[PDB]
């Protein structure tokens, strides 16, 4: 395994996952139009949140501690056993909450209580999301990029067929259930691949409870809770300010070019949890840690720069197929956004080192620094430049943040 070998395997699964999302996304827009798209915005966001919440947000800790204790079989069994009990226990509590609160949840997601049966069905679907993501986190701990990629690819195929059968049978609600089955059905190819590759015995998934390990995995639950609250709030108050001096359509072209970056950056960032996180978790000394970080920066910086320049050269083409061609001025924000993507990717290298060391001190400092930098630059550029300023503030944020990550790392290396 290497950074180059893991990136190629993850790129294949990312290419299929992106292409499958565009096929289901276009089929969603063609079948139900703008009325069904706006009515399903909150429900689709919950499905993305369930990819982390349904397993109590311990997946990054599972990969970290599996890679740390892969040598000792008894300790590795306790890691998988405690993780399995934590995922099964939390998802069961999530199913109970979703059933009892089926009417309020449907009211908060759709505005009415006509989707109670769907929410109760989601209570069982989220279990497949939690168990499927846990098995993928186990493969990431062993740096099994091929096994993780094959599971996502096969899962994307059955997820497209499941969405097709669901929407043709259940109509609009079937399509909603189909969107939930797409991440949940990964548990079937992932379970098959975990036993076909023979890296982990199936008996290790037996739920057990190691108290000391559960508390260690709870540190990553707080990390997932912080990252799902700190930065997304900054974007909410950013789009609020952007939509106060301008319209919400100006916000639409700002979030539109952001979805551009969210897709193509996965060709670089998705391999961080597959290789960089398990590798950095095993390294103990500062000399070996610095070697990996420098080697990773020498790889992801030119790779994300060649991809960003390619996206800029195809920004007119990318606006066409990926989004509705509504405002041709959407091409002028790519230059400022792709530059910020290059430095945000470089900042992800130092960020993933914080995950590998389970440092809550450096994690909060990283999220707070990104929050303060975004709000300071948005309060200065958004009211003057509009959506161009929202992309300009994002670029200037990670220009200074990456420089702050490099400066802090230099003081940490020399101690």
């Amino acid at each position, epitope marked *: 395994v290497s950074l180059a070998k893991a990136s190629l395997w993850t790129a294949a699964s990312t290419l299929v996952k992106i292409g499958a999302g565009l096929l289901v996304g276009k089929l969603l827009a063609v079948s*139900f139009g703008p*009325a069904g798209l706006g009515l399903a915005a909150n429900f689709r966001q919950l499905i993305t949140v369930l990819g982390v919440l349904a397993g109590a947000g311990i997946f990054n800790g599972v990969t970290k501690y599996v890679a740390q204790y892969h040598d000792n079989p008894q300790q590795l069994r306790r890691v998988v056993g405690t993780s399995s009990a934590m995922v099964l226990g939390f998802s069961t509590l999530m199913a109970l909450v979703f059933v009892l609160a089926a009417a309020p949840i449907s009211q908060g997601l759709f505005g009415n209580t*006509d989707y109670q049966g769907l929410v109760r069905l989601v209570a069982l679907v989220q279990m497949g999301i939690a168990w499927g993501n846990l098995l993928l986190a186990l493969m990431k701990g062993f740096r099994d990029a091929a096994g993780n990629a094959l599971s996502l690819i096969v899962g994307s195929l059955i997820g497209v067929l499941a969405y097709y059968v669901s929407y*043709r*049978l259940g*109509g*609009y*609600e079937g399509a909603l259930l189909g969107l939930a089955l797409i991440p949940a059905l990964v548990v079937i190819p992932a379970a098959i691949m975990l036993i076909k590759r023979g890296v982990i015995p199936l008996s290790y998934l037996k739920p057990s409870w190691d108290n000391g390990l559960a508390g260690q995995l709870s540190k990553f639950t707080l990390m997932a809770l912080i990252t799902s609250v700190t930065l997304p709030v900054a974007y909410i108050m950013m789009r609020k300010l952007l939509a106060a001096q301008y319209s919400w359509d100006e916000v639409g072209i700002w979030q539109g070019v952001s979805s551009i970056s969210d897709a193509y950056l996965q060709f670089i960032t998705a391999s961080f949890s597959v290789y960089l996180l398990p590798t950095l978790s095993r390294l103990t000394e500062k000399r070996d840690i610095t070697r990996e970080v420098v080697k990773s920066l020498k790889f992801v910086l030119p790779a994300v720069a060649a991809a960003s320049f390619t996206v800029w050269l195809l920004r007119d083409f990318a606006i066409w197929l990926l989004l509705s061609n509504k405002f041709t001025a959407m091409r002028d924000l790519f230059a400022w956004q792709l530059v910020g993507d290059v430095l945000k990717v470089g900042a992800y290298v130092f960020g993933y080192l914080v995950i590998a060391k389970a440092s809550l001190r450096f994690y909060i400092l990283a999220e707070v620094s990104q929050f303060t930098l975004l709000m300071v630059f948005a309060h200065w550029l958004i009211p003057a430049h509009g959506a161009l300023g929202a992309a300009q503030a994002y670029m200037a944020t990670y220009i200074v943040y990456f420089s702050l990550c490099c400066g802090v790392f230099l003081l940490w290396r020399r101690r």
Partner: nanobody
Amino acid sequence: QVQLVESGGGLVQAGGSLGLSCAASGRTFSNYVMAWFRQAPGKEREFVARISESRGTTDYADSVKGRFTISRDNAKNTIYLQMNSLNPGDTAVYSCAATLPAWTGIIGGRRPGNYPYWGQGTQVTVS
């Protein structure tokens, strides 16, 4: 986008008759799938009837089949519901809904979540 207005509600003795009308606003009314829903005081929405956008195919609930009749007038953008043999159990707020065929699917025509455009609803009381 599509506005719906119900009319014809009132009070009718047990075993009587009453007819509801639902006017829809907007063109391409013939391409829409229309249905009737009711909501008894303190209970959730319940499917009643539904008319198809083609063939005039109808679908009725079990406790309604043989008594209620849904019809469609594409020239007036109006949906009708002739309620015969009215029982006290029929007392509810009857609302009409409009939707497209892709929203209903094959077996999802009786689910209220498959209808995005809803009417306010008129009151029907028996006995």
